[PDB]
Design a binder for this molecule. Structure first.
Ligand SMILES: O=C(O)CCC(=O)C(=O)O
Ligand SMILES: O=C(O)CCC(=O)C(=O)O
Ligand code: PRO
Ligand code: PRO
Ligand SMILES: [Fe+3]
Ligand SMILES: [Fe+3]
Lengths: 268, 267
């Protein structure tokens, strides 16, 4: 009977997150915790059925989606006192999970993620009315320069949504190497020319926080080292999506907007 | 379909609260909001029955647990002007341990003896630690002369202090003459070290104060009322040991469900 008092971000941390559109906290989770998250990720890849995506070239696991609805471990993770208080502080509201994914980015054969803003998809596919949302990516493996790290244009969220060409009809291609919305090179080259690019690194158990509208990308992982990320997308409850205008299953775009509460210490 | 984003306290404000044991935010609620709360309060005094306390004169002095009976007060404790700060200060999800409205009528009012709230919540209710706080909403301007709450700044920083226990039961936990009151010598000591302060402010302000800060107040000699809505928030982790509890739910809550903030609806 005692969890550690909720920790929130410093005012400088908050500033950095607002100016850059991302922020890394190192070693939020320890090794044993990361090993539990890894074992549960594996179970979900094995048993997720239609919720699992596979790589085009190899048929190797690319993603598993909506796990917090199906796994007791992931349903508790999203309420962790290491995460929830910060989601609530950054979004200045009570929050809920809009989306939960584990992106495997396997060694050697892990494929690209093209440049995009997340809000673009959540707005047009799910009816998210404003970009008042964020993601927390938990590193199940050390992130280096060589294993296809998640990459951002810092400050690139200052513009809001950005002209992306749509491509195709339903939603299967929202999770693929070739993405339904994506930035056109010209659009990108200029962002990059103006703002640069940054790929934050960190050890296992770090959490990378980022804005719903920051442009980001990742190159193929041809290295020998996996780069497993657990991505939790937190949305402001006031900003709940309009389910009238929603097109995807629950396991991609949540419908239950109950405010999350933090996990308390129990004897089990 | 918009509430104002949750506001929290600055690092300065938070530091000021921890060192002094209290903090005023001026003008949280407007005159119109305050009036709706004043009218609901009057309803509660009128219909509260056994939950209502009276002063010499039988003038209603207090009513308790209104958040459980009034929809307005049930909503107020979830307000985005209140709940986010209670969570920030207690560093937890929170729930309401106690809710009370204390009237201190113009030319009327009694002397509340020096006391620490946590002394009652620990011994009567089973609150295991002082990880709790109270938010006092000013229904009227609080001045020098209408019996303001008065504190010893930093007085919370030692423990719960040893106190005279008079009476058995809980009737005298709500009375001018309190069940646990602070010894004369012990207070003198505290006051000679720390001094005394009565925070002031306009109507609609909120006075946050620690569960263990010593406080007192005197009768009101102004021709103006001093209504306080006092909401006591407790950390969920700090929930009270219900097996050691002695008082009803309208004084000491037993439903520990984390509060969630109030959202915009069309009604
Ligand atoms: O795993 C990655 O590098 C990118 C994932 C991402 O941005 C997403 O799935 O939206
Ligand atoms: O309203 C007052 O002046 C006294 C409040 C108080 O300290 C209490 O009811 O515990
Ligand atoms: O479709 C989605 O919502 C996620 C986020 C952008 C790419 N895949
Ligand atoms: O009994 C109670 O809980 C309140 C707090 C101290 C005075 N009366
Ligand atoms: Fe993305
Ligand atoms: Fe008191």
């Amino acid at each position: 009977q005692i969890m550690e008092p909720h920790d929130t971000l410093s005012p400088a941390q908050v500033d950095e997150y607002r100016k850059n559109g991302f922020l890394v906290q190192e070693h939020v989770f320890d090794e044993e915790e990361i090993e539990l998250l890894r074992a549960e990720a594996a179970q979900e890849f094995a048993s997720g059925g239609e919720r699992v995506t596979v790589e085009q070239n190899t048929g190797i696991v690319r993603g598993v989606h909506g796990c917090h609805l199906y796994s007791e471990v992931f349903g508790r993770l999203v309420r962790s006192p290491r995460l929830l208080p910060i989601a609530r502080q950054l979004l200045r509201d009570d929050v809920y999970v809009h989306q939960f994914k584990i992106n495997a980015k396997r060694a050697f054969k892990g494929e690209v993620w093209e440049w995009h803003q997340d809000y673009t998809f959540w707005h047009h596919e799910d009816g998210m009315p404003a970009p008042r949302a964020l993601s927390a990516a938990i590193f199940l493996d050390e992130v280096t320069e060589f294993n296809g790290p998640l990459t951002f244009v810092p400050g690139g969220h200052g513009s809001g949504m950005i002209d992306a060409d749509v491509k195709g009809e339903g939603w299967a291609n929202t999770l693929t190497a070739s993405l339904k919305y994506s930035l056109d090179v010209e659009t990108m080259r200029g962002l990059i020319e103006r703002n640069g690019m940054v790929a934050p690194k960190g050890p296992r158990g770090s959490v990378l926080w980022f804005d719903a509208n920051i442009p980001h990308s990742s190159v193929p992982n041809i290295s020998p080292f996996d780069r497993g990320l657990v991505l939790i997308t937190y949305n402001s409850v006031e900003n709940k999506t309009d389910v009238t205008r929603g097109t995807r299953p629950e396991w991609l775009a949540a419908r239950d907007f109950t405010p999350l509460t933090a996990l308390q210490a129990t004897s089990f």
